[PDB]
């Protein structure tokens, strides 16, 4: 049914109005970068490309970049400088995606262009919690009878919670037969998580990933992904 584009989320007044008429998802605080609840050199050796090579369509810090090969982003001090193609998280080089209402899963993401395989979609941003804060929030959310949950594992004692604060990545739904994956990238010595396509995604297709997370509580949510190999429930490892 109703869809919306990512720029629609930049106007909180218009958003709150479209929301009241069921044309946009419920309001949340839109953020650019992870926020830590509790607060807590790496140069590559790529050969600076010439003016000539930039013009032909050559890639600066491409598949042989030693930073890229370790899922580390370069900094502003990269030998390719401005031209470095390995600062996707930092430069918000997100894929062209729209937010759409699904039949039974709530809102979702869909490709607005064809997206090649291994294309960066979006960073999963949110409030970064420790294990204690996370468990507190699970209990609070269960008490409030929330339907949608927004936790993503980042690393030991770091769980991203996009329930209150996040970005449009929070709309990506789980599928047992997905077309995207998470990848954890080191950006300024700190880990972030992003969604990347794992195959060619046709324009108009819903973007999905295989959500993996330790099981908590009782009454696990049912999966409506529609795959022949559906596990039937969301989460688990």
Ligand X SMILES: Cc1ccc(F)c2cc(C(=O)Nc3cccc(N4CCC(N(C)C)CC4)c3)[nH]c12
How far is Cα 42 from Cα 68, in angstroms, rounded to an integer?
11
**Total of residues contacting ligand X (CB under 6 A):** 17
* Residue nearer to Zn ion on the CB measure, 84 or 128: 84
SS3 23: coil
Token code pair at residue 183: 């990848």
Q: Least distance (Å) from ligand SAM to the CB of residue 208?
A: 7
Q: Is 49 in the site for Zn ion (CB under 5 A)?
A: no
Dist. CA 206–CA 153, nearest whole Å? 22
Establish if 230 lies at the interface with Zn ion (CB under 5 A).
yes
Rounded to whole angstroms, the Cα distance separating 169 from 133 reads: 22
Query: Among candidates 2, 17, 37, 28, which has minimal Cα distance to 167?
Result: 28
**Rounded to whole angstroms, how far apart are CA atoms 126 and 30?**
9
Residue of the chain from 66, 138, 153, 230 that contacts ligand X (CB under 6 A): 138
Q: Which residues bind ligand SAM (CB under 6 A)?
A: 25, 105-108, 147-150, 170-171, 173-175, 221, 223-225, 234
Query: In the beta sheet, which residues pair with residue 155?
Result: 158
Which CB atom, from 49 or from 61, has the smaller least distance to Zn ion? 61
84 known member of a binding site:
yes
Q: Does 150 bind ligand X (CB under 6 A)?
A: yes
Least distance between Zn ion and beta carbon 179 (Å): 13
DSSP-assigned letters across all residues of 186-212: EETTEEEEEEEESS-B-TTPEEEE---
Residue 65, annotated ligand binder? yes
Closest distance of CB 162 from ligand X, Å: 7
Stretch binding Zn ion (CB under 5 A), from 23-31, 78-86, 137-145, 154-162: 78-86
Instruction: Answer yes or no: is 150 a known binding residue.
Output: yes
Distance CA 18, CA 9 (A): 10
97 sits near ligand X (criterion: CB under 6 A): no
The response to whether 212 counts as a known ligand-binding position is: no
Give the separation between CA 131 and CA 214, rounded to whole angstroms: 12
Contact residues: ligand X, CB under 6 A: 138, 142, 149-152, 173-174, 211, 213, 216-219, 221, 234-235
């Amino acid at each position: 049914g109703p869809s919306c584009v990512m720029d629609d989320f930049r106007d909180p007044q218009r958003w709150k109005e479209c929301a009241k008429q069921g044309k946009m998802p419920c309001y949340f605080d839109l953020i650019e970068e992870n926020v830590y609840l509790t607060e807590r050199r790496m140069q590559c050796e790529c050969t600076p490309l010439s003016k000539d090579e930039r013009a032909q369509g050559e890639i600066a810090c491409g598949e042989d970049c030693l930073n890229r090969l370790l899922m580390i982003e370069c900094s502003s001090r990269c030998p390719n400088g401005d031209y470095c193609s390995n600062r996707r998280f930092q430069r918000k080089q997100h894929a062209d995606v729209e937010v759409i209402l699904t039949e039974k899963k709530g809102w979702g993401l869909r490709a607005a262009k064809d997206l090649p395989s291994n294309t960066f979609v979006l960073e999963y941003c949110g409030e970064v919690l420790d294990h204690k804060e996370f468990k507190a929030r699970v209990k609070e959310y269960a008490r409030n009878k929330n339907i949608h949950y927004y936790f993503m594992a980042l690393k030991n004692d770091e769980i991203i919670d996009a329930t209150q604060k996040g970005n449009c990545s929070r709309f990506m739904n789980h599928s047992c037969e997905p077309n995207c994956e998470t990848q954890k990238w080191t950006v300024n010595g700190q880990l972030r998580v992003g969604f990347f396509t794992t195959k060619l995604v046709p324009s108009g297709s819903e973007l999905t990933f295989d959500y993996q997370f330790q099981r908590y509580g009782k009454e696990a949510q049912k999966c409506f992904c529609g795959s022949a190999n559906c596990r039937g429930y969301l989460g688990g490892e």
